Structure formats: structure tokens, C-alpha cells
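Submission sheet (multi-component)
Chains listed below:
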Amino acid sequence: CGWHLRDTTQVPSTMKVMILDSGDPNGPLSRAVRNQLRLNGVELLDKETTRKDVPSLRLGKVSIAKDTASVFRNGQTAEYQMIMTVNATVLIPGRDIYPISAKVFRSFFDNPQMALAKDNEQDMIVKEMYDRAAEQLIRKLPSIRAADIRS
Amino acid sequence: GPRPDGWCATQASGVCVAKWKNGVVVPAGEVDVRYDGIKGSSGSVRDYGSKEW
Amino acid sequence: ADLASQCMLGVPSYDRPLVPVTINADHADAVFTGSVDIMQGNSRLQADEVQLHQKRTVDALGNVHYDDNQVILKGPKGWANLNTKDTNVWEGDYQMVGRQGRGKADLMKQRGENRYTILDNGSFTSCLPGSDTWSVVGSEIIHDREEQVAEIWNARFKVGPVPIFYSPYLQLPVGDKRRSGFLIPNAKYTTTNYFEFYLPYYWNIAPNMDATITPHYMHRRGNIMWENEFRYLSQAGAGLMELDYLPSDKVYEDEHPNDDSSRRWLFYWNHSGVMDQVWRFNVDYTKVSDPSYFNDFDNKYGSSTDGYATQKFSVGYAVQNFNATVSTKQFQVFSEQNTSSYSAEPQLDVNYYQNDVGPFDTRIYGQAVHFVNTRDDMPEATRVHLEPTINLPLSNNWGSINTEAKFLATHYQQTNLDWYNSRNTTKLDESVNRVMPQFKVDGKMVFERDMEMLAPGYTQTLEPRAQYLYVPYRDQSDIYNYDSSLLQSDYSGLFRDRTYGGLDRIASANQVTTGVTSRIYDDAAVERFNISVGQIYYFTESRTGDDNITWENDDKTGSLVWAGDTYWRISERWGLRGGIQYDTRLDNVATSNSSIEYRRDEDRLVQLNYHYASPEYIQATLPKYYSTAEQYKNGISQVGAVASRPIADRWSIVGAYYYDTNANKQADSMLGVQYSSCCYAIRVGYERKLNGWDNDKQHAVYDNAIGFNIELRGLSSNYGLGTQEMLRSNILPYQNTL
Amino acid sequence: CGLKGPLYFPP
Ligand SMILES: *C[C@@H](COC(=O)CCCCCCCCCCCCCCC)OC(=O)CCCCCCCCCCCCCCC
Ligand SMILES: *C(=O)CCCCCCCCCCCCCCC
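Outcome: structure written.
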């Protein structure tokens, strides 16, 4: 048992004060990302601040696609494969920009007899995918810190 | 000009297609979504590349 | 050595820098001879006999070679004016600089600011020299570099030496700018609907709107269906409208001869945008003429496949701490069974968040909805919901625990209960009040270890997670189930605080959830591997009052739900995924899936996947008709394979094969080949798919289909092999799972 | 022959 408690925070020490930049600040993804950064302890700053020495996380395009995954014995679709792709870039002030991405997979069984109930279930799936893709973007920050050191 | 610089005056299909520059709104993106086909008993659309300038 | 490089090898390039009359002759109305070179701007004139006239104009005779940053000219006679920036070169040939166009002519003129290329009795082709695959020789051709077109008068399209087409006027989009004209036509033969043909026509109305009219001629029905599309980009967002209209159907008149008219139409409207960062407009509307529209124009055999059309509108207003939305949601069911459905008309959602109320976080959620059924006998009700919340999040470097309290209050007002009550035992109530709190505790930890024994510089984590949820029991048998459905439990779904998606069924919970995740990071802090295993332990039975799910075991308490995940990223090209879901009340595995993929680039990829769904899972969730029909009751168990490989960098073979191991019969099979060249491209496709069930004989029926495309190349900056468009041309489309 | 492409706001 060579294990030990984690001694370093998930967000690197150089990104403990960050600027959240997004074109849809009131949207569902920006709220999910802003919620994750609160948990880790990041002190988010306004875009129009006087600080020019803090990294900025610019949130980009979000795409959700739904397709057929498998079918019954008469050709009717059985389950839908939903995929969400999120793009973002982190602008270290002076050094470079480091693009990151997150991809989330979900499955969804349709039932035409309960059509209103499956729309609320499908709305719940998409809301949870914004939370999964918001976590994957945070986990890609320590790789940006290590890439910055090497370059 | 009411709103500040960079304010996304219009976002379409996940990308911003117009932003305030200085007191005026200027186009800053493009949208390319086309009709895909029938997804069982309904329509659908497909994104053939939408980006921000 | 890809197709972009091969077609650019024969393309001339400009060598001089991009920015005055310097002559250079052996023997200098001054007449020059021997070998000349006239440089004015970026242009150059080469000849062996050039003389001035002055007043400044030049006259070149013999082996004239005009050079520019846009075109190249060759001919035995030349004439130019050094002030008007014009050139007149007689019979010879021209070739574009930096792109692929070329051709011959009899009188080629350069005009104002070197923008026009006026042609008399000339030809235009996009192939490389020495090919002559096709040409568009016409009486007069005009090339302009600004609008990027090639207008041709008295054009005669030719394939080889055969003038297969004639037209008074014609335009070719030599560039990338949008232009209205005919798009790529399709040909298709199917074993069900027979020969078909598409003739798209583009229309460029404005920079922010366009249309496309596509006459689709189906041979079996003996009429043309007009597929219309209108795209727009307004300040409120971007959307499109689709209107397909078939004036008369000869097949439909046989199936339904009593109807006065046999017209078929479909309207689809999709909108999505945000205005001023606050207003959020969304539309997703679908309407059709008859219930058998989606069976006919989908190559479906009989009226057995179920489905519905979604007709939703929404208008919202979002701020950093508040958002309110009004939306109506309606549906149209297309099954042979009961087609009654409910619709929310309208629904109001209100949210309010206020963080930093001390050490707590505050949230409020409200909703007011109205339910109506298509039938006049089913009940209708109005529901009002309030849901205040409070958090207390605590965290440090190695762990975090969050404690949440919530309150749920709902009110119902149900009418039209006379028919339902008169033939059911559990009567519904006019007014229902359902108030019940909720308490949840969540905890996490993270460990680390330096796994230098296996790999140098790697690290591994271990993230145990636990949760406790308590919801009291309120009887909900006197509330009709309007929009509540059972939810699936993947690994991350084990920690969800709801069992049904909706507000009509809220099952009591008294349980503890446990899980663990183990990730492996390499020396660049890049995650490669992660695996998760979880479970739910129920201390008391979860009762929702109704309790009408067909389980297999009479199990109520204990470890009843399990789930897992896997994602190995072996290399930049390889990638493996997994997931399993086990339920003890099903005494079987509910659902499972896997996938392994290699993908060197866009063109080259191999993928193997698997999908499972137990017979008991179909029985528990899907309706009672899915547990007895031979086409539903066996569940899902299929193996898929997708591959792609280009040969000689111009060909591209694509295949797919999905196989249902329960019945030992295939479900889908595809094979596409496209040959991409410098000035044309041909695609051929095949697909065999399930398209219905034969009740009389009790076996499924298939639908073959073979297509044929053709395209012109070199006019635009396109050199793709079409692999990604062939991979998504089957009912089970390719999805990048890397 | 035409060329379908993305939409944009007028300049
Ligand atoms: C420009 C695009 C699509 O254009 C087309 O090819 C579609 C057809 C164009 C003409 C439609 C007919 C309606 C026109 C109304 C006006 C008519 C005026 C008449 C006045 C007298 O090009 C493409 O993308 C497709 C490539 C074209 C392929 C052409 C066939 C190639 C193979 C030919 C082999 C021999 C065929 C012998 C036929 C007789
Ligand atoms: C391209 O989509 C059509 C060319 C320009 C349309 C305006 C003139 C209509 C008649 C054109 C003849 C159709 C043949 C097009 C070239 C194959």
C-alpha cells in the first residue's frame, strides 16, 4: 500500500484566479462550468477587469447529437446514442493558448406510448451531460500547467 | 452605444454571429445547418460547419 | 501525395513577389526585337517582336507569353495599352495561376484593373493538362475574379468530344462564394419504392437567407414530390423550414380509395437562437398529413413501426441568477395501438439562485403546467410546484462533503374524471396536495500513488464516493401519471436523487450509494485509463404508491442496482469503452455496451461495438405489447463492425455490418465506394436494412437500395474522398467513439 | 451549377 492522500488541488496553483470568458454567460454550460470552478476554489474574475496577468478560460461551441444505436427485429429504433462535444481554450497571459475538449456519451430508450414523459427524461439527460462535460474540462487543466512548463 | 465591446448581440446554433465593436453591432460568425432527414417520425437538422470569425 | 497535392502539381504558381515599364531587348515608334520583357506592375510581357507607338501602347508579334498573378496567356499575336491595363491576345490558350481552370480560345482580352477575361469562341475546363475529360466550350466566356464566376453564352457542355448539353446561358462557380444554381443530383433504386431521382436547385436570396427546391420523382407513385427548404438568419437566431408536397399519390389511392384526395405533405420548422444574451427562442415543430406518411417516405413496409412527431415551442429569459421560460409541448403518435397522448399547454419554469447566504447556497424552482389529452374522456389537470433548496458545501485538497436539504410542494386540480373513475378501482381526486421534504448527504475522497513499478513517471488515483438519500413516503395513487417515466441508472446515475423523470411520481428513498473510480495519468498529466464500479443499497422498499412495474424477483431491500464504466486511451489512434448495468430484481444484466476503435486519420478507421438489452429489461420498462410481440420481446443483442480504407489515395472503400446474434440474422449491411479525381468524383452505395415485420409469416422483411452520385471538381477548393459522408449513410450511422 | 454555403449577416 503505497497510497497517500492527494496533497495538490485539482486546479493548478497558477489558475486559482481565472477569467471565465464565454459568449453565452447565462447559458446552461457556462453555469455548469462556473459551478465547478466554485467547488475547486477558483476566484473567477470579470472580463472587463484591469488584470492582464491571469489565465482566461474561453468557452466555445457546444454540439449535441442524437442518433440510432440499435434496433428491434422489425427495424424500429430501440435506443438512441446522445453525444455532447464541448470545445474551449485557455489563454495563459503571454505564453500561448491551449485548446481542450470534452465528449460525453449517453443512451436513451424511447417509448412512444409515453411521449411527454420521455421528453422530460430527455431534458434531464442533456442537463446532466452539461455537468459531465464541465468536469472533464477542469480535469484537463493540470495537463495545461505541465505543458506550459515544458514549453 | 448601450452595451459594451464583445457583447454577443445574436447567438445562432451555438456560435455568436454578431458582436458589439464600439457602439455598433458587427457580424462575427456564420451558420451552416441543413435539413438531414426523417428520424423515425420527425425531422432533424445537421451542422455542416459553423464557426466564429 | 494526397489528392490535394496531386491536383496541385500541374497548377502553375506565381514566383515574383506581390507588390515601371522596364524593357529588356537585344536591339532597341521605337522597335525592339530578339527577346523582350516588359514589367509594369505584377504583370510581365514576353515576345520577340515588340514596338511602341507612344502618343504608350505596345504591339507584340510572335511567341507572346503574357504573365500575371492571376492568368497566363500564350499566342502568336498580341496588343496592349500600358495605360488602360488591357491585353488582346489572339488564338492560343490560357491557364489560371494558383488554381485549376484552363482552356483555349480565339481572342482573349484582359480588362479593367486586370479583373475580366473576355473570351471569344473559347472553352473552359477544370481538369489538369492532358486530360480533356469535360469542357464547357461556348460562344463567349467571361471570367471575373471578384464575383468568381464564368458566364458562358451559347454554352455546349461536353463530355469528351460529345456535346451532351446545350444552353443559351450558363454560369459556373469558379471559387468559394455562394451562387444560385443546380446542385448534385442523385439516382437511387430500392426494392420497395423502385427508381427515384433528385434534382436540387439552389437559390441565393441574400447573405442571411437561401432556398432549395428539390423535385423528387418517384416512379411507383407516378408524381413528383417537391422538397422545399428555406434557411434564414435573423437577429432572434437561425432556423429553417421544410415543406415537402406530393400533389397526388397513386399508391396511396390504392390503400385508401375512400379519400377524396391523396395529397401528402410534411412541415418541419426548427429554430434556435439567443438574442441580447437574455432571450432564448427555440422551435421544433413537425406536422404531416396522414399517419402513414412516415412509413411511405422512409422505405418502410407495413404500418407496424411506432413513433411520434414532436411539436415544441419555447421562449425564455436568462440572467446570471434567474431564468423564466414558457413552452408548449405537443405530440402526434403514429402507432396502430392507442394513440392518445398528453400535452403541456402551457408550461412555466422559474429558477432563482442566490449563493453566499453565509456558508449556504440557496435555490428556488417553480412550475405551473396544464395537461390536455387528445381524447375527450381522459382526465386533465393543472399542477403547481415549488422546490426551495439549501446547500452546505465543504471541501479541501483531498476530500469534499456536501449536505443538502430540500422541500417539495405540489398542488393538483383534476377534472374529466367521470370516465376514468367509473371503470377503475383506485379513484382519482379533484384536489391533491403532496408536500414532502428531502435530505441528502454526499461525500468524496481522492488518493494518489506513484506507479513507477509499471511505468516511469505515471500516477494513479482512487476516488471512493458515498451518498445517503432520504425521502418520505406519500401515497400517489390518486394522481394520474402524466409525464413521469422510469430512469436508467448508469454509474453516474446511481447518485441521482430521482427515479422518475417528471413530477407525477416521486418514489420514496432510503438508501446509501457507494462507488469508486481509479484513473491513471501519464507523465504529461494526461489521463489514459479510468474504471468505475458502483451500487445502491436500499434500506427500505422504494414505493411510489402506484407500484406497477413487472419485476422478476420479489426483492425489496439490499444491493439491487450495479453499474460500471471503462475508458482506455491506448494511443492517439486506439480507444476502448465499456459499461454494464446489473439489476437483481431482473436476475440478469439490464444493459451493456462496448466499443474498440482504431482511427489513424479521417479516411482510415476500424471499429467494433456491441449492444445488449435483456428480455427482462424490455418487460419491466416498455409497454405490455413489447413483452408478447416476437419483434420486441427478445431484447437487443447485436455486433457491429465499421471499416474504411483508401487505396491509391483516390479510391475509398467503406463497409458496415450489424448482426443480431439472438436471431442469427443481420440488421444492417452497407458498402460504399467513391473515386475522387481532380475534375470529377463518382460515388456508389449499397445498403440492406430491416424495414418492417410480416405478421402473417412471422419474419422480418428487408429493403435493398443502391445509389449513384456524380459531381464536378476543381471549381471549388474541395478534395475530400467522401469517407465521412458514406459512414453516416445507413440506419445505424458511424459515431466517433475515440 | 451552384455552391451552397453558410449564412452570415450583411456587412
Ligand atoms: C451543375 C451540377 C448539377 O447540374 C446538373 O448536371 C443537373 C442537370 C442540369 C440541367 C437540368 C435540366 C433543367 C434545366 C432547365 C433549362 C434548360 C434550357 C434548355 C434550352 C434549350 O453539376 C453536377 O454536379 C453534376 C455533374 C454533371 C454530370 C453530367 C453527366 C455526366 C456523364 C455523361 C455521360 C453521357 C450522358 C449522355 C446524356 C445524353
Ligand atoms: C446550375 O445550377 C445551373 C446553371 C445556372 C442557372 C441559370 C440558368 C438556367 C439554365 C442553366 C442550364 C442548366 C445546366 C447547368 C450546367 C450543367
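Remark: Chain D has no helices and no strands.
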